[PDB]
Structures are given as C-alpha cells and as structure tokens.
Design a protein around this ligand. Structure first.
Ligand code: HEM
Ligand code: HEM
Ligand code: NA
Ligand code: NA
Lengths: 713, 713
C-alpha cells in the first residue's frame, strides 16, 4: 500500500516523538521496574546463570562445553552500538532483541544466545528486564571463567519497540566505503553521528578496513570507532584483548550456506535466523562471521595467553574455510584445543584487528605493558567492561542492586552527595524575590535556565541542570550559551547565593545548580505576571554542584548544542534541514509533538533566542508569557517569503499593505506548514486557549527542569 | 536514513495499532469533546458562517461573490472518501486536513476553503472540531442558497494524525487503470476495499472512465463506486444533481501552470498548495480540475435548472481551456452567468458524468422523476446529503446538538429506546448462575458473545452486540458464527430470558442483547474458576433488541467477518497473509498490540475457535482461563514445521522425540515469530504472569463487550 512516506519522502517525521506510548507497552501505567528489580533475588538469578553456562542444548551446542564466550560476545554487542555523538544505541534499552539489531550481520547467532536465556527470563519475569539480563549474563560468563568483575548495576527498563536511530544511509548490508551512500569522505572521515565502519557492524571489519588485511590501517578504524563509543586507547586495548581471551570465532564453511537473518526468516523459525546448510549447521560446523580463529590455549578460562601469543609468534596471512582473511602463527605447534574433538588441536590464530594491538605503535606500548604486568591488564579490563556496559545508564542514582561499585568514576559525570538541609518553600519565595529584585531580566533568567537544563538527552541520560556544569568548562564557553551574557547572569546569581548561604543557620544552603533553575522559574512567573496571569511554577530542590575535576571536558563536548531550535540557533550549515534538527532535539529531550510545540512558542516570546534575534518573536509584548506566537503565526493576513540574501530566513508582510511585520526561520515557519504541527499550533492559537497555553507551558518547562532528577525518581 | 521497512518491506506493521496515543493529542487526558460541543452556541457559529459565504478574500476570490459552491464541494469531499467494505474514510475524523487527503488532486484548492474557515475555528476553539465544522459549513452554504437541509449532528471529535488507510498500490497520482499496480482486474472489477477509480480521486473521473468521454460507460463507474460508499441509484442521482445545482468547476488555462500540492509545497506556502502561474492564479483565472463548466443560470441559488438543462438541450463534446473533455448545449443562448464579469454569459455546459444521469437507462428514469417533480428531488437530496455526511458517525446516541433529525433511518442500524428498569448487580449474578446451570459450556458462552460483540468497527462505529442482531438475518447465518451451534445457544438463552422476565414485578426485564453479553461474562468467570481463580467480569446493562424490520440486511453484509484471527477463521484463500488480516481486525476493534495478544491467547484456550479447530489450542485444560497459549508457544522444546498438505498450517513436535504436540496457523505462530509480538507473548508467558494475564484478559474482554456503548459515554 502506498504511504505518506512514499508520496512525500522528505516531509518531517513526527512519529519518533510518539514512540514508546502507553499503547505499545504491555505493563500497567504504574509498573515501576526499579521496584520490581529491587525485590529480585539477584543471587538466585546468578546461580541459574552459572548453571546455564555448561548446560548444552542440542539445537546450538556449546563450544568447549561452555557458553561463556558466546555470552560475552552477546553482552559486548548489546553495549557496542553506543555512539557518544547522540547517546543512542548501547545496552540500556535491550534493543538487541528488536529490529534492526536482532538481524545485523555482526549479531549473527546472538539470536541463539538470547534464546538460551528465555527459561531464566521466564522464571523471574518482570523482576529482571531483558536489558539487565543480557549484561548480567555477560558478567556471570566472566565470573564463571575465572575473571573477577568490577560490579554490576540493574535498572535498565525494557522497551517494547525499536528505537528510531540513524544507523547510516546504505541500502546494502555491510556495503564497503565510497558507495552512493558512503559513510566516509575525505581522508577516511566517518560521518557523525555514526560509530561503525559498515552498515550492520558493531565497530570495525575484523578482516581490515574495507576488507584489506592491514593491521596498521585497521588500528586507525579501531581507534576512531572506539573513541566514538567513549573509549580511549588503554580501554580499547583492554577490552579487545580481554574479550579475545575467551571463546572462538565461527567460519567452518562457506557463508553461502547461511540463510535468512531473523527478520527475513520464515514464521516457523520462531524468531531465530541464519539457519545453515553446512553439515550439521551448528556446533563444530557453525558459521557466524566466516572467520575461524581460537585465540588461547584455554578458551573457557581467564589466562594471560592472548598477549603471550600476540607477541610470541610471527604472523602469516591465511584464509579461513569460508574464505576470510585471518592470521596464523609461523612455526607454532598445535596447542589450541578444538571446541568439540578432544583429539584435535590447531595452531594459534589472530584477526587482523587483534594484530593491530601489536603493530600500531601506540597500542603496542599498552599491549606490552599489559603483557609484562598482567594485573594491570586484569584491572583495566574489569574497569573498561563495567564502563562499556554502564556508559548509557546515566547518573549513579539510577543504579540498582547489591553489586553496584562504590567507586565514583569520571565518566559517570558525578554529582556530589547532598549533606545539608534543603531550602523550603519560604526560602524559595525569598530567593525568587531576590533574583527579580537584582535586575535580571525575564530573558536572561529563562535563557540561562534553558541553557543549563536542555543539555539532557534521554538516549544515555547524560546532561541536565544538576551539577551546575554550565558554570564550568566547556559549557560556559559554548556559543549557544552566549558566554558573555552567561557570565554576567552567573555572577549576579552567585552573589545572591553567597548572601543567602552566609545568612543561614544549621547547615542550610542552596546550590548554584538549584538557584539557576529556581531563577528561571522566577523569570517564567514574572513573564506570566507581565501578561496579567497569576502563575506558580513548581520547583524541586536538591541538585548539587559538581567540580571542574568531576567534569571531563572532552566527554562533555558531545553535549554541545550545535542546533537548538528552541533558541533558534544553528552553529553552521548542515545537510539536514533545521526543522529535522528540531525534532531530533525534541526526541533527545523526551518531548512529544504537543510539548515541543508549546515549549518553542513560549520560549520565543520570552526572549530565549540566542543573540536576541527577532526571528520568530511574533509578539509586541516580548517577555510576557502569552500565546502570541501561535495567534500571529497563523494569521492569514500575513504573507511569507524567503529573503533574497538567505533562503532559510523569511519575511512576513501584511498581504494588503506590503508592510514588514515579522521575520522567521524554517524552525519558526514549520509550525505554519507541516500539517500535524499546524493542527497543534491551531489549538494553542485559538481564542479559548490562553490559559491552556500557560498551563501547558509551565508543565513542559518543569518537565525539562527535572529531566535529570533521578534522585527524586 | 535506512529504516526497518526498507530492510524487511514485508514484515508485519504494528504501528497502526499505536496511532492516536495520548502522546500526540494536544488536549488533556480528561478532555471530552461532547461536553465542549454541548455548550457551543451553534446558532452563533451558523451566523458567522452565513456572513462568511459572501465575504470574499483577495487571495482566493469568491466565485459569484459567494463561497457556497466551494464549501459544498469541500464537505462532499470530506465525506466522500468513505468505503463501506471497511468503514474507513468519511468525514467523521476531519482527516481532510492531514496527509494524504489534504494533497489528493481531487482535493485541490480545498486547502483554500479550509483556510477561509480558520477565523471561525479560532473564535470557537475546542467547542467545535474541524471535523464538525467542515460538515456544518456545507450545511450553512446550502441553507444560505435556499435549500432546506434535513438536519445536522455534531460530535465528530478531531484527530491529530493521519489514519492508516489502504487507498491503493499505485505510485503515480491519478494513474490510469491497467498499470503494474492496477486496482482493476477482470471485467472492470475494482479491488475491495477501494471505492474510487484512480488514486487521488473521490469516486470517478469527470471526463469518463480512464478519460474516455462516454456517459454510458461512466455511469457504470458511478454506480459501482457510489455503491461502495453505500449509496443506491436514487441517492446517487440526487446527490450529483443536487451538488451540481451549485457553483462551477475551474479550468481557465493549462494544468501545467499549477504547482506543488500542499505536502510538497515550500514552507512559505504555510500549508497551502497548487499555486498557479496562470494569469492571476485565482478567481476568474482559477484552475482546479481543468474543466470549465457552470451548470445553472443561478449558481448561488437552489433551483431545478440542472435537470431543466440536462433534458432541455442536446449536448455536444468540446474541450475546456485546459484541454479536458466536457459538453456544451450549442443551440442554447448565452444564459449562464460568468463568475466575475457581470457583462458576460455563456452557454450551458455539463460533465461527462452529469450526462450519465440522462443516458444510463436506470438513472434516466430517476432523473426524469426528479425533473418533473423537483419537490421529490429536494427531499431525496436532503436525505442523501444527511446520510452522506453522517454515515460514519455511529449510533444515534453519539449525535449532538439542537438540529438532530428526529426521524430514525434504517441505515443508522437503529436500536429501540429502553423504557423499563434495568437489571441490578444481584439480578446479573442470578442470571449468570442460571446460565451456568443450563448446561451451556464455557466455549459456547464465550464464542456466542464474541460473535455478537466483535462485529464492531471503530472506522464507522457500526456493529457490536447492542441490538441482538446476531439472532437476525443475516448475522445468524454467517459461517463464522457457526449458525447451527448459535441457534441452540440462542434458544437456551431465550428460555432463561423469558423465565426471568416473567418473574419480575414493576416493569424490570432483560434484553436478549444484554443476556448474550452477560452469558459470555459468566463463561469467562467460569473459565477463571476452572483455573482456580475467583474473578468478577464487569457487566453494564442497557442494550436493547432491534427487530428484523429495523435491520437492513444488504447493508449488514459488509460487517461479515471473513477473516477473524481471534477465532482462527479464514472464510477463503486471500493473497494477504492471515497475520496482516489479524492486525487489520485488531485495528477495527480499537485494540493495541498488547490487547490483541492477551485477547487471542485467552480466546484460544477458551474454545472460541470456529469449528472447534485445535489450531492454536495449546493447552491440556481447554475451557480454563490460563496463560497456557503463551507458555506452550514459547517452549523451545517444541519445533515447528509447515505441513506438506497446507503451508499455512504448522506442526509442533517435541524436538527430542519427534512426538506431535500441537498444530497452528500463521495467526498462532506469528506470536512466536514477530519480534515485537514475541516480546509481548513473553510477558504473558512468564512464571509471574498468571494474575496479570487473567486481569488483562478480563479488561480487554469487557472493552470488546462495550465497544458500541455510546449510551454510557
Ligand atoms: C575491534 C573490535 C572487535 C572485533 C573486530 C571483534 C571481532 C570479533 C569476531 C569477528 C568474532 C567472531 C564471531 C563469530 O564468528 O562467532 C568475535 C568473537 C568474540 N569477541 Fe570480538 N571483536 C572485537 C571486540 C570485542 C570486545 C570489546 C569484546 C569483549 C570485551 C569481544 C569479545 C568477543 C568474544 C568473547 C568472542 C567469542 C565468541 C564465542 O565464543 O562464541 N570482542 N569478535
Ligand atoms: C460522480 C460524481 C461527481 C463527479 C465526477 C464530480 C465532479 C466534480 C468536478 C470535476 C468538479 C470541479 C472541481 C473544480 O474544478 O473546482 C466538481 C465541482 C463541484 N461538485 Fe461535483 N462531482 C461529483 C459529485 C458531487 C456530489 C455528490 C456533490 C455534492 C452533493 C458535488 C458538489 C459539487 C459542487 C458544489 C461543486 C462546485 C465547486 C465550486 O463551486 O467551487 N459533486 N464536481
Ligand atoms: Na542509548
Ligand atoms: Na471512517
């Protein structure tokens, strides 16, 4: 059936903002997964998982009698989709079980891994999510094989449909670079926000870049994609060499034997795929990647044999039984055990990308250090595996259960504990009055709190106003944050703060994080007053102030808004139209279309635009909270045309007189163009809507202010 | 951005069932449009709309100084998308304002018509929906031009996104038939459920079939598409001649002048389209369809001049200024006024399709009657216009406001008023106990009530258990309803009914509609009992029993379930896969994916299958309400293969022994295959799920039982 997408493939898609409704969710609207999990007997789950490790099923027999390797790969692929650019992907939503990730080529036969866990999932039911279970199974596999983990946190709630993520534009699985939808240009520059070299791969190609088996050039791709997953060189070497301490690859025959991936398979395959016509199709005969490598002499036990082999042999380029490039140790004895035949052994083998750890000069130094100092290796890999599998979980307040590590890590963007009484309602009213008496404007107050709060993204739950990181590097210098104006607001709030705190008894004090947000509430209340309305804006104290030392400047860089339609800001030219960038930002903020609508209409009349631009300021009473934006946008007495100078700025003129009334951007005008957005603007631009507009605005404002407040969850 | 639909274009689409969530609705969750509308000053709206008719706006000047014809066309197109095969389309949701209908070529310049309404929509806000307003505006246009309408009901609540409708498979607007995606086959047989000849047309081509200007052959396409919109020959002639009493068509120059439709237009167009480069692009120079016909000597006043002209002249083929085929009376004087120049007149003209009303033999008899007796014409047209514009509104209980016609029309599937006291909670318990003591089985009870209630479709709100039409023709003979079995159940319930009613004092009695539902509730309660659980199934009395005289048998035919996955029933072979037909039935029932899941898994183990098929009956305790369907479907100990005899029936065998355990259809096994549905099945198949399964079953059961109960709204 022909769809709207077919007729108008370039129209904006809003259904990303209405994903994950109560309609698709089988659990009741008050189901709280954290509460369910906190009562789970996690020790009992771990016992079952230990028992599963050596309980081989005949439809997918365990290599070496132990599913540990398979489960470690499973959990690493669960986490391995993460991109620091947008926070999307990662293990935190258990998206490995839905399309498209369940059917990516690099996830081949992880459908079998997930099926092996159904009896445990079924036993514990709602008290352990798939998302948590995948990770927990990875940890138990490590532990079962003699590797002490750093810890584990539960709390990843299950999801019920695919996440809308941009995974690239290629229309061919695994397409090599330089095609019509190439993700590479220039000197092998991978397009943001992508973090994989080919469509359907986790990070890199194990044969080498575009299949060329050059470990030096493969190292460049490893370093770039791991960095785009938040990992440095030390973590990268620890993760790859730690993971390939275990298990094996699967390439026993030609890949042509493997049939349809799970989304393409017949109904009778009951959710599984990649059924293989090669011999038994499984076990000794398994084909997954097409490579046939077993790294160590004890593939079901933690050892130091990875780096012994990597350094201890010279390597020769060979081909697996499926035809894939791989390496074999020159002159070695047959020391590597077979997965199924006790009487067979083979020579040590490596992937191209394992050799990168020796032949890239920076990796080589780290690899050598880990070879000479195996305790450092073990500790780095323990830390890196915890980071891998928790990087998208957000603040530590979300972490549940008895195995959470007490050590606070830099990457968690930590927020100090609050150890003093919080301001009360009377103190808040006092501080708001101070703020409004300082001479700070509506615009200033609203802009600052928006700047502080709107860094949040729900994809990985980073950002938000807690921590008062707007006063630190790098946020204080972001162009969207108007650094000179920002500094003058923070100076004035800091003096208010110091005066208030210096007057208190007991240990009562307000943080700057809380004051920034309360000040913005005061600005919204003053704006309402300016429009003739009595409005109280909710405020929840309890934020604390992070230090510079608790704020990794390079990791914060990915939170910078280079496009923020809510401040009519675009830092440069993008190929994606500005209204598409708006919808993307609304999605990261967790807003619906109605919420995005109301929020933007309000912010325009409150003076939140960067640079005091007039674009979209469709009111004669700036800094008053009204629905003027909508009423004026929708006035058919105004005719709109793109300007001569810039086709993304428009002038609105009186259709009768030709007089200039307004200017606007695409972000502004899209609310008068797009037929779903226009229908929302009409609600808010009606004669009976001023109250509804104010109430709805205050609600979304408060929502944004509280995005990161998982301490109150 | 490559999507899942790109990689797997034939996978089942569930997002149809999660449309219209609370996420996308700008109105609060307690907004009740009926309550809003009941306090609208309807008379005031109609005054504003009357004034509008003659208040020309320079961006779309009114023909003849009067927008009445434009508004008539607007409201006819709003209603004219309706199809009786599925109930989809129609004016009841205001979908003309969304894609794709806002941009259909037959909807050209209706965007201007909707924009002329915004000031009124704005004035009255949420108290009149767009959906009601479009229709009301057509009524006021009629009335302002001297035509007495039959009535008007409000209550069509607005929607906030496009409806998912199959409008055809063609990939080119207006594609002539016989293409690669032809909607015709055989001897010009149009595919169900479509009701238009070309993609983007309301019903037929005004030039004739695929542009052949033969009025005789055009009449066959009129008859077929009107019939697919539930109109007979009398109603069709009345509607066409009545609508073409007014206004004109627009074809002043070549169609190449006309630019992008609204969804393709630039952002500066602010939701309008079809901008024309022909001269002024509007008014005297307007181009819409490309035809240039003005039917009567008084295009702004009700008259009988359509038929005077049609019969009074002999007609000759000519071409409009855009090159379209049309007809002119060459022997006539210049008697037809120009729309903008008071000094110009022209000859009478007609469309091909207008001439069908004289040259088709069955039409000609009716047109002749209406010519000779224009009072009969006026009355047929008023009745047909009311039917046209209310056909999708559902039961009369939904009709709001002061202009509802008191006459009860057979097409409305009327339900008699209830004039007696209703049974109370103790009476319901007594009746449940009597039903269960009769010997009627859980399976009988469940199946009967499912059969009675599951005719409902939310597309046009027809069907459901109110009326007890399951005892009447044609429902009592539908093969899905198991007519011999059903008759035995209805006999037993009827005797229970007569006994209970004969024992009452003071007028209290129960309807058979209510008893059929209540007996079903007893069956569900007994099934829960059989599983070891005491539950009470909610029941709301107040249904009444319709007679055979109040039931149009021919109109009921479209409600026959020919595919009902909930009873594992397919009346024949279809090219559409059975699981697709399940999701389509779930959508018509207003079910979300979780509701569909729970409901189907319960009905399987209750014995609701047609013919007591064992397909999907994955339980050893049939007639007990358990989660067995899910537990057994998901058991990896069972392996599934298509049968040799039928590739859509599957055998489930023990993986170890080969012992035959179960059989299923695609409808059953989709729940173990599809990655979203299987995630749902897992919830209800988990060890902690027995309570949740029974509670969710009872809720969805009760939902289905109450679908048509707009008397309790
Ligand atoms: C440069 C990055 C990486 C590359 C290119 C890569 C490549 C692969 C390939 C091709 C396989 C074989 C799949 C099969 O045929 O069954 C595999 C297996 C595996 N990888 Fe990696 N790997 C990477 C990083 C990781 C990381 C970070 C971890 C975990 C910390 C990991 C742990 C595993 C383990 C445990 C297996 C064995 C699976 C089994 O025993 O069934 N690898 N790797
Ligand atoms: C066989 C069915 C019909 C055909 C093929 C048809 C065709 C058309 C065409 C091609 C136009 C010209 C559009 C334009 O160029 O502006 C139009 C105009 C119109 N039609 Fe129909 N029509 C049909 C049935 C109806 C019915 C059922 C009604 C209402 C009861 C209706 C009422 C009107 C009115 C009022 C106009 C004039 C619009 C104006 O004044 O701007 N028609 N018709
Ligand atoms: Na994420
Ligand atoms: Na409908």
């Amino acid at each position: 059936g022909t769809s709207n997408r077919d007729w108008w493939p370039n129209q904006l898609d809003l259904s990303i903002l209405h994903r994950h409704s109560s309609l698709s969710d089988p659990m009741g609207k008050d189901f709280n997964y954290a509460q369910a999990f906190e009562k789970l007997d996690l020790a009992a789950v771990k016992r079952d998982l230990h028992a599963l490790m050596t309980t081989s099923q005949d439809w997918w027999p365990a290599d070496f009698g132990h599913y540990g390797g398979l489960f470690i790969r499973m959990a690493w692929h669960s986490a391995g989709t993460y991109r620091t650019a947008d926070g999307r992907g990662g293990a935190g939503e258990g998206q490995q079980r839905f399309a498209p990730l369940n059917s990516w080529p690099d996830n081949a036969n992880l459908d079998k891994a997930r099926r092996l866990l159904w009896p445990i999932k079924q036993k514990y039911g709602r008290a352990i999510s798939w998302a948590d279970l995948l990770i927990l199974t990875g940890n138990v596999a490590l532990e079962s094989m003699g590797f002490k983990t750093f810890g584990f946190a539960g709390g990843r709630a299950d999801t019920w449909e695919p996440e809308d993520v941009y995974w690239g534009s290629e229309k061919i699985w695994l397409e090599l670079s330089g095609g019509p939808n190439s993700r590479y240009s220039g000197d092998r520059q991978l397009e943001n926000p992508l973090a994989a070299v080919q469509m359907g791969l986790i990070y890199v190609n194990p044969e080498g870049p575009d299949g060329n088996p050059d470990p030096v050039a493969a190292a460049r791709d490893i370093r770039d994609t791991f960095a785009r997953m938040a990992m440095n060189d030390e973590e990268t070497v620890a993760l790859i060499a730690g993971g390939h301490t275990f298990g094996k690859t699967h390439g026993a025959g030609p890949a042509s034997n493997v049939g349809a991936e799970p989304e393409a398979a017949g109904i009778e395959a009951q959710g599984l795929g990649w059924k293989s016509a090669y011999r038994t199709g499984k076990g000794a005969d398994a084909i997954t990647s097409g490579l046939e490598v077993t790294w160590t002499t004890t593939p079901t036990q933690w050892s130091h044999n990875f780096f012994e082999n990597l350094f201890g042999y010279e390597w020769e380029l060979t081909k697996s039984p499926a035809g894939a490039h791989q390496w074999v140790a020159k002159g070695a004895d047959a020391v590597i055990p077979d997965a199924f035949d006790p009487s067979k052994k083979s020579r040590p083998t490596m992937l191209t990308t394992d050799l990168s750890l020796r032949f890239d000069p920076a990796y080589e130094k780290i690899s050598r250090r880990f070879h000479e100092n195996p305790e450092q290796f073990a500790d780095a890999f323990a830390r890196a595996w915890f980071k891998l599998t928790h990087r998208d979980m957000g603040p530590r307040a979300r972490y549940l259960g008895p195995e959470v590590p007490a050590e606070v890590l830099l990457w968690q963007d930590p927020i100090p504990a609050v150890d003093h009484p919080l301001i009360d309602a009377a103190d808040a009213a006092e501080l708001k009055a101070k703020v409004l008496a300082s001479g700070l404007t509506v615009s200033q107050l609203v802009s600052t709190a928006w700047a502080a709060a709107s860094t949040f993204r729900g994809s990985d739950k980073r950002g938000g106003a807690n921590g008062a990181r707007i006063r630190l590097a790098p946020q204080k210098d972001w162009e969207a944050n108007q650094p000179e104006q920002l500094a003058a607001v923070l100076e004035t709030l800091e003096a208010i703060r110091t005066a208030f705190n210096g007057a208190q008894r007991g240990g009562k004090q307000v943080s700057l994080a809380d004051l920034i947000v309360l000040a913005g509430c005061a600005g919204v209340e003053q704006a309402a007053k300016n429009a003739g309305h009595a409005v109280t804006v909710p405020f929840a104290p309890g934020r604390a102030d992070a230090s510079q030392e608790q704020t990794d400047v390079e990791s914060m860089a990915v939170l910078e808004p280079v496009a923020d339609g809510f401040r009519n800001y675009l830092k440069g030219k993008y190929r994606v139209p500005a209204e598409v960038l708006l919808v993307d930002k609304a999605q990261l903020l967790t807003l619906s279309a109605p919420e995005m609508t109301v929020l933007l209409g309000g912010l325009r009349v409150l003076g939140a635009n960067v640079g005091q631009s007039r674009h979209g300021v469709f009111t004669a009473r700036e800094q008053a909270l009204t629905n003027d934006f909508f009423v004026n946008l929708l006035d058919m007495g105004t005719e709109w045309k793109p300007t001569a100078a810039d086709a993304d700025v428009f002038e609105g003129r009186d259709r009768a007189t030709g007089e200039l009334k307004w200017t606007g951007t695409r972000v502004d005008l899209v609310f008068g163009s797009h037929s779903q957005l226009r229908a929302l603007a009409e609600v808010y631009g009606s004669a009976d809507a001023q109250e509804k507009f104010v109430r709805d605005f205050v609600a979304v404002w408060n929502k944004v202010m509280n995005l990161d407040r998982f301490d109150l969850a």
